[PDB]
């Protein structure tokens, strides 16, 4: 149920778009409390984070975030 207000290409996301993406992940995958201050970046930078980087900013569910983001990137490449 990806919010319709998000551009299909994650690299075009603004910082507020990134926030909306993370909120979606949180409620869609029942993730616990996420520290949104650790994701103050636009889509371009978000897509450059490594699995490890997500891991430091979210020890509990970084892999999920990273995986879902990659699927969107792939899904947009086509």
CATH of the domain at 72: 1.10.150.50
Q: What is the domain count for the chain?
A: 1
The backbone torsions φ and ψ at residue 58, rounded to the nearest 5 degrees and listed phi first, read -160, 80
Resolution (in Å) of the shown entry? 2.2
Q: Which residues of 66-76 are buried (b: 16+ CB within 10 A; e: fewer)?
A: bebbeebeeee
The backbone torsions φ and ψ at residue 73, rounded to the nearest 5 degrees and listed phi first, read -65, -45
Elucidated via:
X-ray
Q: Which residues contact 21 (CB under 8 A, 6 or more apart)?
A: 3, 6, 10, 13, 46, 69
Neighbours of 17 (CB within 10 A): 18
Query: Which range of residues forms the domain containing residue 52?
Result: 1-78
Q: Which residues contact 29 (CB under 8 A, 6 or more apart)?
A: 61, 64, 68
């Amino acid at each position: 149920q990806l919010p319709p207000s998000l551009p299909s290409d994650p690299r075009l996301w603004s910082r507020e778009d990134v926030l909306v993406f993370l909120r979606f992940c949180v409620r869609e995958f029942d993730l616990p409390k996420l520290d949104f201050d650790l994701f103050q970046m636009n889509g371009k930078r978000l897509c450059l984070l490594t699995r490890a980087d997500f891991g430091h900013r979210c020890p509990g569910a970084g892999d999920v975030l990273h995986n879902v983001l990659q699927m969107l990137i792939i899904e947009s490449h086509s």
